[PDB]
Every structure is written in C-alpha cells, then in structure tokens.
Amino acid sequence: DEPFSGAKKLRHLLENTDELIVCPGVYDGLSARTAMELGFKSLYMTGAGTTASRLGQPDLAIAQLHDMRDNADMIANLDPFGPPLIADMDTGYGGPIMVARTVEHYIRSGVAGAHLEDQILTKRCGHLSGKKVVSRDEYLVRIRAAVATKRRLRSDFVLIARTDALQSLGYEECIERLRAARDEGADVGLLEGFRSKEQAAAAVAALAPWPLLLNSVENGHSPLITVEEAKAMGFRIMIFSFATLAPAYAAIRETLVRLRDHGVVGTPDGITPVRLFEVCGLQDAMEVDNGAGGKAF
Amino acid sequence: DEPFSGAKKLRHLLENTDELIVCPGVYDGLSARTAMELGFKSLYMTGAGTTASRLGQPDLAIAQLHDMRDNADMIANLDPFGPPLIADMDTGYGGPIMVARTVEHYIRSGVAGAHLEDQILTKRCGHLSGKKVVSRDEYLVRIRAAVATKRRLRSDFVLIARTDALQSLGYEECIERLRAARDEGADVGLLEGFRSKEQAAAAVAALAPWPLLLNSVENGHSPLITVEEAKAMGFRIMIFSFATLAPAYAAIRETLVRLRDHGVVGTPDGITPVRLFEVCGLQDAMEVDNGAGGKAF
Amino acid sequence: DEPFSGAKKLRHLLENTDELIVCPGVYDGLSARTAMELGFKSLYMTGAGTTASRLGQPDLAIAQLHDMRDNADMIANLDPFGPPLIADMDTGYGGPIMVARTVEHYIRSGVAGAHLEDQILTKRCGHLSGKKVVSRDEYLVRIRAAVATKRRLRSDFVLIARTDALQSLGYEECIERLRAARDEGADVGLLEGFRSKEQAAAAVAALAPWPLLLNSVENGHSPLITVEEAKAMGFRIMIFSFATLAPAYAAIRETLVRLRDHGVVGTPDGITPVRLFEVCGLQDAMEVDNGAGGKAF
Amino acid sequence: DEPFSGAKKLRHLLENTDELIVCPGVYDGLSARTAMELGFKSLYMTGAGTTASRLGQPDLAIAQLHDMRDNADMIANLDPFGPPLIADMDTGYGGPIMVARTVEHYIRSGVAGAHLEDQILTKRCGHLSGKKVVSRDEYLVRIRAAVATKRRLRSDFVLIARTDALQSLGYEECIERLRAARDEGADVGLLEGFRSKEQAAAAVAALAPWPLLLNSVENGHSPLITVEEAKAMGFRIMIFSFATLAPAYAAIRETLVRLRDHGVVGTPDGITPVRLFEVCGLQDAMEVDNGAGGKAF
C-alpha cells in the first residue's frame, strides 16, 4: 500500500497468486507511461531498449550501471504507487563488488526485481550468436553477491537468475545452473532463448515448483509463445523485451519516410501534444501547482 | 569535413544555400538513429520529447540543463561526421549565468544550434494556454548572454531567438522582439505558434532577409503547413517537433493493447532485434572490435 | 533500524530528544566518509560545496535538481544504516511542480530532510549581498508544495523552512515568514545569516517550541556561535556549511604551492592510499567479494 | 589558441619542448580550480580520487565510463582556454567497443590525453597487492582500439600506455608491453609502481626517445622521486595522483575532530565563502551577468 513498494508488490504477486505476471518491455518514459495507462500489473525494463534509447547504441555491454540505474529509477517511480518494475541488470556490470552495488542501487531506487545473467562481461543480446558464458562457479559468485545484498538490505527484491548457456553449452547445463542459482537464493529462473516450445515446457517442469520467467523477444530467434501458451506451460512471469521498442521504430521510420517524401508527418490527429502530456502525468503536475496555491494552471 | 563540426555544417547550409532545412524532431537514440538512417540533413531535439522520454513527464520546465545537455550530447554525436543537431534550450534554465553555461555546454557537446525563448522560467509547451513571457528587456538579457558566449567560444553555433509572445501580447510584439534579438546577434528567428498561414508568410516578409525557422507541431494548435508551403513562404529552417514522439506513442499504445487483449505483440516481422541494432550502429561496433584485433564478432 | 531510514532517524532525534543535532557540512564522498568515520550523528550536504566540488562553480543557482539529488543520493547511502542526511534543496529549482519533484526525489533517495528557501530562483549564497527574496505568498507556495509531497509519500522527511529575508526585509519579516511556514507544515525553521548572537537567541524564543536550525558559515558574515552557545540558545539543529570545503581548500592550496615551489607533495605519511580506501569503504568491498566466494581479496 | 584545445596544447608541450610536464592530480572542481589558480601547465584527473569524491568508494573498478567522463568533462572545461587535462581511463571500461567509446567521449569532452592500462577489468589501485593483468595480446587490443579511435577522430589526443605488469610479471615484461604499445601507436608510456629509482631511470633509457610518464603516488609503495630527480631521469610527464585527495582528507579530518571535540571549525579566517567562490569562477559569472545587461551583481 506504501509508496516505493514495488518489490513487495511483485513478491506478493509471485508468492500469493498463481497468475502469469505479464510485463511489457519498456525503455523510456513514454513507453512506461503507456504501459501504465493501459493497466499492466508489472513492467519490464529492457537493457537492449535502454541502450538503444538512452545511448543510441546496440546491446553490446555499452550501457553500464549508471545508465541502467538511471533509467530504472526514472521508470519505477513515475508513479510511487504504481506497478512493480523488473529491470535487466545484465551481468551486474563487473565483479561481485559491482553486482552488489547494482542490486543495492536498484533496491534503493524502488526497483522490484532484476535478472542477472552468466554472460561474460563483454556481453551481447541473448539472441545474437557468438554468445559466451562464464563458468558455473563464476556465475554463482554473481548470484551470491546479489542475494547477500538483498538480504543485507532486508528487501523483498525479486532476483531472477538468467542463464545464456543454452547457445554454447546446451540444455542440461542451463538446468544445472538454474538449480545451483536457486540454492544460492535466486527467486526465479530465466532460461534465455528457448529453441522449442517443448523445451520451454520441459524447463518449467524440471525446476518446478521454483518459478520461471519466459523472455519473449519479438521477432527474435525463439518460438512465438502466446500468453495463454506460457500460462499453460506453468511460467509465472513473462516479459516482452521488444514490445515497445520494435513498434516505436516501425512507426517512427514510416512517419519520417512520409515526411521525407511528402512533406507531412501524418500522425493520427488524436495524438495531440496535450494527450501526450496527459499520458505523461500532466494532471498530476497541474494538481501539484493548484494544490500549492499556485494559479499557473 | 571534421568530426564534431555540426555548427559549421548548419551554418554553411544557412549561409551558403537557399534550401529549406528540414529537421525532424527526435527525442532519443532510436528516433535520432532512424532520422539519420533516412538521410535527413539536420535533426532537431525536442525539449517536450526529451522530457517525455528521459523523464516521463510533461513539458512543464521539468527537464533542466543536465537532462537537456545529456540528451543533446548523445544525439549530436551518434555520428561524429553526421548531420547537425539543433537543440531546444528552452529559457536557458535560469538567469544570464545559466543561459551562458547552457550555450557553452551545447557548443562543447557539438550541438549545431539551439532555440532560446522569452517564456517565464516556469515555462510550458508553446501550444498550451496560460503561457506568459518576460519583458523585452529581460528576454534580451538572455539573448545577449547566449550571443556573448558563442562569440567568446569562437563558435559557428546557430542561435535561434524564439518568441512565445503571440499568445499573450500579439503579432507586432513578436516582430519587435525578433528584430531586437536579431540586433543582439541571434542568427535566426522563430515566431512560435502562428495562428494562420497568412501570418506565417507575413512574419517572414517582416524580418527578411534575416532567416526564420518554422516550428511545425504535429496535431497541435497551429495551421498545418507543408514543407513545400513553408519553402514558398521563405522560411529557411523547418522543425517537426512531434514527428517521432507522436507516432511512437500511437504504435506503442496499439501494440500494448494487442498484447493486453490478445497475448501477442504482433509487430511486423522485419523489425528484428538485429535490425534495430543495425539502425543503432551495430556495424560500427563490430568493426571497432574486428579492427582492434578482437575476434568477438 | 531499517536501511534507508534516515528520515525516521532524524525525526526521532528531533522529536524524541532535546539534543542539539550537530551536522558537519559535507560536499562529496571523501568529506562525508570522514564525518561518518568520526561518528557524527547527522550530516549536512551543502549546496555551495556541492556546486564547488561537482561543478567547479560558485553558489549562484548553477547546480540544479539533477546535480543536487545525485550528490545527496550518493552521500545519504554510503552507509544504508548510517547517519541521516539533511540536504540543501535551495529554492526547489523551479515552481511548485519542481519543488514537489525535488522533495519526492530526495525522499526516494533516502535523504532525511532538506532546507527550502525564499530566495528568487536566480539565488546566491546567503552570505552574499544583493540577495532578494520572493513575496511571502510565493514562498508559501513552495512550502505547501513540499509539505504536500512529503505527506503524499507518507514520509517522515524533515522539511526545514529557510528564510533569507533578513538582509533585505529585516527581522520581523523573517519571524512572520517562519511562523507562516510552520503553519503550512514545515518541521523546523532556519533564519539565515543572523547579524548578532542576541538576535539568534531572540529568534529561538520567538518561535519556541517550534525547533530552529542554526546555519554556521565558517569565515562568513555571521557571528561565530559555538556548539555550546547554540545549545544554550535553544537551537535543535546546527549545520556547519563550510566545515569541510574550507579546510580542504586551505590544505590543497598549501600542498600544491609546495609541489610547485619545491617539487614534493609533503602530505603527512599516515595518509596512504590504503587508508583513504579504508575511509571510503574498502573493508565493506573486500567482504562483499570474499563473502560471495570470490578470491580477489 | 582556440577554446577546447587541450589535446593540441599537451601535444605541443610534449613534441615541442623538453620540459618535464608537471600535473597535479585533481579529483573535483575545487581541487582543479586550485591547481589552475596556482598556474600549473597541465592537470591530471585521478581515477582513485574521482571514485573517492564522486562516489565515496575505493578504487576497485567502481567508477565506470559515465562517472569518469562526467568528472573529466567538468574539470577539462572549467576554463575553455586553460591547461590541458590528462585523465585516467583505467582499462577502458570494457572490451574494445568500450575502449573506443571511452576515448571518443574523452576527446569530445576536450580531454587532452588519458592513460589506459593492462589490468583485468575487475581492476584495483596500482599500489595494492593481488593485482593481475591481461595477456599482452589482450592489452594490445585495448591500445589498438584507442589509437584507431583518436586517429578516426583526427585528434591530437595523447594516449598513454600504462602497464601494471611489474607486480606480477616483472620488469622485462613491462618494457616489452610498452614497446609493443608504442608500435601500436601509444604516444607515451607509463610503467606503474617502480620499485626503485634505479629502475625508473632504466625504464626511461630502455624506451628513449619515446616519452615516459612517471606516476608519483603520495604515501604509496613506490620511491619518493622529486620533480628535479624525475627531470634528470628523462621523464617527460610526471603526475601526482594523490596530491590533492590526501591533504584534503588530512585537513577535513583534523577540522571535524576539532568540531567534534571543541565545537568550532577553526579554519584559517582568510578562507571565506567569497574567496572560495572567487577560486571557483565568481568573477567570470558576475561578468556574464553584467555583460548581458543584467544588474544582479
């Protein structure tokens, strides 16, 4: 009920319901505000989207802690009483010291949970080839550092252990890494980049009743699994990493082509500056001014 | 020809051609990369879009120098050899000291030019009502501070004097403010929020041969003027403030509604993660690694 | 007892003790770590010091919300279980919308309290002449915006109402502003820049039992009041704005003069890199690595 | 002669004089302003000091590109016409992509040069034990990425190749790494943490006429070499990493102890707020206001 309680809210959804928690992947203020406008119960901050939008760069370990925390801090708190934010935390941005710092900063920024992976520090989008992972022991050092931090901070922060090991090491290796991560205290597992739907269902069964998160990558190299299919498979969380970045690009490109070729933008006329401001908290802002005895609005 | 020479490039377009310089309004890395992909010769960074995307807030003087400079620094330099960036600089974010600091920071960040307005410091989007401006003398203090700075720094920075005075003080007041600003050293004038096309053409004639910039606000409260109409009116620059923010919102919202109702994202399948990375400089990054003797890619 | 509970801790000191809360003014990680090392029960983040250190500029409204919040966020959380931080929040960095945003951001960053003043937005260090203030009504708009925010956020945040009105409007005006601010919900009053010790004691009596905070400015233009004198006067908080910035400058300058003239630094040999790291949390960091199963340290 | 030409200035000092370029190590705005006040011809930004001051943490790979670039950008440009800044760039903050990004960002921020080391990414202050380095080939990948970037950007940026290999691999290994780095295009070599003065002189002779930089670490684990000794050894640059951080700590601590025990700060009375503002550019700021037609000052 309290402000900044996203971790508690997400934890309650996980531990106190059997619902499949659907998290659209957002990457900036506009995408996040739109997901909130539509009543999603939880949001996901994509690292790839954060890098594309905040830095104009590809998902190649270019965004680091500062950029990622800044974006997550902004998104998670647009509404102090709003939906929990699960944020990508990549590899933790360094060794255990940085992993711990990252978890600490996300927690203090009101982030509800985060996924932490076993990629080498010079990482890459999980759907790109040539993707290498660290040893099981080195991965567990990351998991332990993160878990110790959330415990030290007496936080309900939901730590998701992600493994990118499928591409290079295979299925069994992923399952063992996730089991190990579970024992070290991770709350949810994420096997990245399933190659088949049968494999997705099998991973859920292999780790049950420990909850799994399914990462849907729009137009990527994994099977198209629907929300209803995921729920039936037994997933507890499903994130849609490119749910907003992709259509934003498609629309921006087609609009700018129209502008280039025809000299007009041609955006549907209901999308006015004021509507965009309304989506982005205009009413709240005007109420602050009015409530304070201001007469600006 | 040199890297980071956006100010020189824009200046050349202005002083050495009669072309109408078309600048799509961008607000983040993805929108800017898309405009660059399509070959626009100049870009515009919207303050409203920057605030919506970087902060998730309405255009109510919430973004300040740090946010605005950070966004402009990122956008202007995605390609050190790319198109010039004209960036909103709002009111300068304070008194003359801040105006000067702002111009100094934009210049050092490779920004090609910026528009500086006469709104009170607690400003608002120029298409919102209740919009008040400072006195002519106080506005000119801002213009002088900015001009002195670009001169002190021996820069070709293009300073655009914007007046928001039409709403509250009328046309003649705008023209006089722009003439005054011209004499203090502003390079281009921007009469914000024309009420009619006839009025737009008249302002151009009133100030000729001093160049004007037309601010097209998609779905806003000013006449829809096309690129060809603007060119015929004699404008030298035309910016499209909401050209990317608006369609991005429309697309994100419709996609997320589909996700909510139907459990699938449904973005056209050609918009893959790799294509988005390509738009955002994947090839460049891989060449850096390969050229350095790395074998990551 | 909980991490990030600085507001609760400061509130308890204020409401549940009669102690004079002594807050050394810190401005960066080193100054803050040193105050913590020495066991101070509360810290103060100086805006002037933050501007000098983070920006290399004078206290002339050059630092804005981003810089100030970033510094306060860093300092308040060096130890999640450490002493409360009272942070300068200047004028709130804009109109009521910005005042509210500022208070919201400080609260979420674990800041325990902050002082909010009645200077015009283009403000200046309170010990500089030519210092103008806004009307009583405009000041109260700021106070109301801040109080509404801390209440909305269900926070124990300690809001200190500062008045800079003495210089231009006199004593009685200050007292009335502070009384008004108290009624609007400010927790503590700060009459800036007393001209005499008798005047300091008189202000405390005028507002009792509402607590006052005394701002000691080292080498400034107000009387030198000692901790014991302040306690006897009835002050409840005393901050030492320049307690670390000033001696740091003196020492840096004398060392660099020695280096320039004599080619050696000559710092006392007990001040080793490792000791500085120890002050700045080396042990904590090594324990994180060791505890995670790392063998780096 | 131009603003933001630190790289050109440093290059000229190096290539066009035989002077030993003395760079006091600065870490914030106050330390940098003080070095400038005293007329030093070049400054050095310490990574350890940046981490202690901006983040309150030890030099354990906690500061990353954003923090380091932000600090260097601030320091290098306090005076657009002032002394060149050499900035620590640690390992480059990732693989070749990040190394290149770092060099690109430093260049665009007006930084004159930077030192890039062969430590593993989870690095540590060079005077701490347990310090491991990457292979020669992996180090050269960093050097190549950095050199290619400065060339691509047509910059005079001075790239200093630092090797931390002495501790673990010995002298000959250091010399070979530096020779290799020279061939890949590094401008200056830095053999970190000499164990003896004889060894310092020998390294200079081994690499002559390729210039070396001597890193003096105040109160550290390397011999105390004076400016005159360094010049006689043939070093071309000498940086004093802890020249300001160390005495600042000593002074802050002794002042705060006095405050704690005796209730007074006791800083020499000539160190007034106004003097600190003067050091930090007060006059400049007032001239901006006055020159713009403002009457604030």
Ligand SMILES: O=C(O)C(O)(O)C(F)(F)C(=O)O
């Ligand atoms: O969005 C993300 O950053 C992500 O990690 O989920 C991903 F899509 F890039 C991925 O790597 O699968």
Ligand SMILES: O=C(O)C(O)(O)C(F)(F)C(=O)O
């Ligand atoms: O995009 C902008 O921030 C702008 O200034 O051009 C505007 F559209 F918001 C405006 O105020 O007209």
Ligand SMILES: O=C(O)C(O)(O)C(F)(F)C(=O)O
């Ligand atoms: O430290 C501060 O910023 C301060 O506000 O307390 C002051 F000292 F600058 C002041 O204005 O008195």
Ligand SMILES: O=C(O)C(O)(O)C(F)(F)C(=O)O
């Ligand atoms: O100041 C620095 O960060 C440094 O790199 O020069 C050092 F002193 F920490 C070092 O590692 O020698």
Ligand SMILES: [Ca+2]
């Ligand atoms: Ca339209």
Ligand SMILES: [Ca+2]
């Ligand atoms: Ca699709």
Ligand SMILES: [Ca+2]
């Ligand atoms: Ca010494």
Ligand SMILES: [Ca+2]
């Ligand atoms: Ca004194």
Ligand SMILES: [Mn+2]
């Ligand atoms: Mn990711």
Ligand SMILES: [Mn+2]
């Ligand atoms: Mn704007």
Ligand SMILES: [Mn+2]
């Ligand atoms: Mn202050």
Ligand SMILES: [Mn+2]
């Ligand atoms: Mn270093």
